[PDB]
Amino acid sequence: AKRRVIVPIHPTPNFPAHFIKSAFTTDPLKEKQKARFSSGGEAMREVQDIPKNLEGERSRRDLASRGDTEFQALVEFIEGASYDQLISGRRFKKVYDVLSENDDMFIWLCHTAMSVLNPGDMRSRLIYNHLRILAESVASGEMTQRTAFRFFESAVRSPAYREIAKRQLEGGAATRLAGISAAADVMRRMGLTRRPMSSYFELYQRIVERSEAMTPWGFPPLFQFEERLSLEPRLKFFSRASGHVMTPHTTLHGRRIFWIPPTWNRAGRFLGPHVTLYPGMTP
Amino acid sequence: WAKPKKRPKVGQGFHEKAQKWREEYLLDRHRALADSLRAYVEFSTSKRVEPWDARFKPFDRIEKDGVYVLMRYMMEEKLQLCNYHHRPVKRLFCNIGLMGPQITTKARWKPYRFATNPAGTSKAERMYQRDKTVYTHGHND
Amino acid sequence: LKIAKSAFGFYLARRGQRKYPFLRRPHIKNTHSMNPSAPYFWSFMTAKSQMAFLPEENYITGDWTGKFFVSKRQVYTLQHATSGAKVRVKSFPSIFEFNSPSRWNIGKEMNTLTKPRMDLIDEQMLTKKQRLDYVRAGLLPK
Amino acid sequence: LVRPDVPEDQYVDSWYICTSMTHHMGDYRPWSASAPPNAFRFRPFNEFDAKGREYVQY
Amino acid sequence: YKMPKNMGVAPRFDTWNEKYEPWEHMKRMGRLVGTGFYIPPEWYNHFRMFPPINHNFQQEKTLNPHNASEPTQD
Amino acid sequence: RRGKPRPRAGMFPDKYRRVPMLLKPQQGGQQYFNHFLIRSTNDRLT
Amino acid sequence: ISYMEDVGRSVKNPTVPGLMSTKGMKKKFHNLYSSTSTKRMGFSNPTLGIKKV
Amino acid sequence: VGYTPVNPDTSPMVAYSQYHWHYNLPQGMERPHSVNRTFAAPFQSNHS
Amino acid sequence: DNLGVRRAGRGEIDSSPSHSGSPVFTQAKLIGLSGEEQLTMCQSETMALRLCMAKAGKETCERESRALDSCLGRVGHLRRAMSEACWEFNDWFIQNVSDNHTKPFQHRPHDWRHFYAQEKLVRERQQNGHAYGRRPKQFSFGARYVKTDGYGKRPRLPYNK
Amino acid sequence: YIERXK
RNA sequence: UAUACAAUUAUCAUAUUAAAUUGUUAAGUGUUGAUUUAACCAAUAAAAAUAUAAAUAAUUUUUAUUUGUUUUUAAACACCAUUAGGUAUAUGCAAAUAUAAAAUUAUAGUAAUUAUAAAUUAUAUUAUAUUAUAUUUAUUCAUAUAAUUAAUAGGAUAAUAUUUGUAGUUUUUGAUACCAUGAUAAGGAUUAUAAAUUGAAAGUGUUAAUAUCAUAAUCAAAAUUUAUUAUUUAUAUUAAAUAUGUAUGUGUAGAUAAAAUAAGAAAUUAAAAAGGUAUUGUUGCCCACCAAUUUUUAUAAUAAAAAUAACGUGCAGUAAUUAAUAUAUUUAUAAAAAUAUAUUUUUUUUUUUU
Ligand SMILES: [Mg+2]
Ligand SMILES: [Mg+2]
Ligand SMILES: [Mg+2]
Ligand SMILES: [Mg+2]
Ligand SMILES: [Mg+2]
Ligand SMILES: [Mg+2]
Ligand SMILES: [Mg+2]
Ligand SMILES: [Mg+2]
Ligand SMILES: [Mg+2]
Ligand SMILES: [Mg+2]
Ligand SMILES: [Mg+2]
Ligand SMILES: [Mg+2]
Ligand SMILES: [Mg+2]
Structure with a gap:
């Protein structure tokens, strides 16, 4: 069948071992596949997300001098308006991720405020301590939101609870103020946010947006919380996120940020992104 | 890119056949040439139709007046001498100067192939009735 | 090339029907070299001046053992007729010979007296396919 | 913008790569350093534009 | 034979609740802490003395709609 | 193109894509605005 | 709308039917141009191509 | 790659590589060379 | 990112x-666009x-x-409204x-x-718990009126063959 | 279609 | 060789507490004739509507009774054969899926298993997330030839070299006319208008490890068969390298070409639902007959069954070129095919009194 015979190449002063096994393959059914991607120090530290360990003096020194990361991210995004840099979608992504680091925690709290008919009186130290503890356990990942919610509603309140509820409520829906003042109170007294207001604002906002939705305070049991299958990030419930003939061959041809810029072997007629072919006249 | 397939052998007795064919092709070409030179010179000497277009002016005008007068009394001998071939006719009209600038600009002349017809031509079909065995380049009667 | 008619058929590509800059085509083949003109007879495919000397090839340049064919640009001279000697020209398939002398030849090149593309077509040099195609053209009878 | 916005004399079109590079690698001078101090629409001089300078001169 | 598209990843519609039910984590964490070899999370330090309600059962194991399962959500 | 159907018109980039919005259409007659304003005010008073 | 005028209507169908007969011509749809199948693997779905009659 | 070796003076891919000077570096002279000054060779023609 | 949401974007495969x-492919058909x-x-x-156009000229x-x-x-604007609301419906529905x-x-x-089985069962217990999925034999167009005395003129229960 | 196996 | 089913839910043949059985209605003639069918052929065409209550539960019907085969066409449709006819639907006989079972095949000795369902497989007229395909102009398309690829050597105005004139045949073999891997083309189908490109990777003669027939290379003046090419169309027409003699025929067959970009065109459409006996997957797999052989037996045209890798016919199956599966009857080179019932291990299309 005239099978292609490839001679193996041994490491060389300019052609090291890992280079060989990565850039060269002796099995020629594996030629012309596609490009592969790897990472070194910083892109790997981002991707792999290995939480550091506390350690001896240097790590604690670095915890001390740490300062505000939320403001740092923002500075670094903003700094793309400096004359010598561009405005980066990555710098913005890092900004975003630090603004939303808690996020879902707030989301959880929404459900405890709005998703529960008659959660007792939420001012009383008892139910309050239930709420406090469960919140601190949703943050710091000790519990799943589902488990914490099912805990919250099944938490112990008071004997003959329903029959006491018949002495206040008709159809068993209490008033939601005590709940929100409580759920803001917890996030404030827990240290959840670096800047104090953010707790209250986010919790409030997320409710006000959902107020306009059809059947706002009910949720399908499966999509309400963490489960195997989920909703797309636009539809998640209290979430923050709620030519033309020639274009596939054009691709590169706009104003395009690149990663690896194209090269002359791999692109025949492309001139580079900066090029302006039909220039206008400007003073 | 296919490997070119080899050309077959020449043939037999073909060298003599070809020698012969070209040879008598030339001996024929001699009578072709002779006949055509006769036809060409014969054309050159014989008379032709008037090269001007009588549908425009200064020609449409009645043959008793205007240009034709200038032609009858002053130019006649000259025009008949060159047998109304369009090149010397136009050139003579240039040199007579009493028309002067107009010969090219205002006046209008029959297209090349029509102006080439023999004197006394009646129907246009006469363009395609000229002999086709002769090589004069449409310069034969 | 498809068929190799010569050496070069191995080396050369046709490249479709391809246009060359005016009056430069790599292989000069004068199909028009014999192209009858009564009135233009002395000016067509001949010396741009009548006052020029005959080419190099009308003269013996050096001591020759002898030649097979004289070059096609050698003009026919009255002696070519009179002397009654072999006058050979390289044409295809093999060689053309001036055998039957005439004075109508004189003063033209044998580039002009030799028909480059003959109407006689051997079927022995043709593939069966080629013969079919020539039949399409209404050249070969069938 | 694809590349930092700076006078294009600092950019060279690369060979073999479709992209541009800085002929002083990685360094940048802002427009303000091309023209004289406090130049209106940074300019050789504030009076006229290019064409204006030229025909005034004429 | 044609199926509904996502049946491969279709969740168990009876039992998918069990995993997350508070009593479960109470028991598990209970015998995990008991070892001496685990540091109790603080939620466990709390619900240790206020264990959750007894007779609330899901609608999956009890098949009744009319059963009011929850003292709270009723 | 070749042995295939031509695309629908909207499948092409805009014909006038390189001509600035101010140009299509031209707004000309700016001279008359003021005139017709004073005119309409005088009218009102009448 | 440029050039408005008050002129009366004309008679319904003032135009005389053309010299090319549209009636005797059969309308072709699927096989008209030539296409290339993007089908990656497997037998082409018979319901689309061949199934009715 | 071939039986004809790349002549390293003309080829940018040699010249501008990491083992030589790329065009965006500042193009000065690297080191001075005194050859004819250090050791000098006396003149002996091959022709008398 | 489209895993775990086994539904992909919108207007999308x-x-x-x-x-x-069974998937919902008729949405436009609903709002009557x-x-x-x-x-x-x-x-x-x-x-x-x-009417006016046809009456006189x-x-x-x-x-x-x-x-x-x-x-x-x-x-x-009415239509843009309806289309908008319907996209909201597609989301709510999802x-x-x-x-x-x-x-x-x-x-x-x-x-x-x-379900169908439940009724086959019934027709069987009526037949003394016997003929499952059996039905009365179809007769003829003229069944009743072409048959002489002694032969069944109407189709019986299957157990009653 | 019948011949497809060649 | 011996050495521990289930008993809460298991699809092919051992049924069992059940209310049925019986109903005499309908439809038929005016006249000169292309109905039905993707397509043929025989040749009057209209038609057959009514029943609930009630029957008690279990304990000795298992040689009993019972599970869509039916007189009468002088009545049709329908079906089968093709103009001639056959047949045209529960009074004989006829237990039988609705599950009591212990790995597949196999008449209960043959082969070593078999069966199976959700991964994967590009086109089935959806709302303009925000604007247009139905215009213009084109189509006679040809060109290659006369063999030797193997290494260095400096000069006038310089402190002296005849080194002027530098003389050691013969043991290797691939880029060739020839097998002898690589690598860049062509090819418009949904990241849009702002400070902006209407040309793509999936590879088109010459390029780097397979050697074991041969010198094939332009330096002029040369021989049409090759899919892959925009030529000058009627006032004036061959001077410098030599430069194209043939085809006037009503802008005329079929079929074809190009374009939305400094030009000038404006309203009809398109996104979302789908199967695989294959498993880098339709150029995929399989099905029967048709020869040899091998092996067991319960020998039916020509025994049966199991292993099996020829030859020859097809193309049966995988929603698969008239969807499949089961029973029933018929038919037959071979898979199988026709009809009668049930049915989805086949793909879906959806009136809560109009
Ligand atoms: Mg199927
Ligand atoms: Mg699937
Ligand atoms: Mg049984
Ligand atoms: Mg290649
Ligand atoms: Mg035997
Ligand atoms: Mg047998
Ligand atoms: Mg079949
Ligand atoms: Mg088949
Ligand atoms: Mg079938
Ligand atoms: Mg079947
Ligand atoms: Mg059968
Ligand atoms: Mg058969
Ligand atoms: Mg069958």
């Missing part, structure tokens, strides 16, 4: 929401104007054409109704086989 497992049955805004208009009516194109001028192609089809008769 595998974006379609499902209802008891683009349907054969589709909701029609203005009829009285166009029929009025057509002496008098001409732009009096009707104005009423009518006023009507259409509104119709545009959140609170659709199972994302997870549950067995209800819409073909064999999916209800258990």
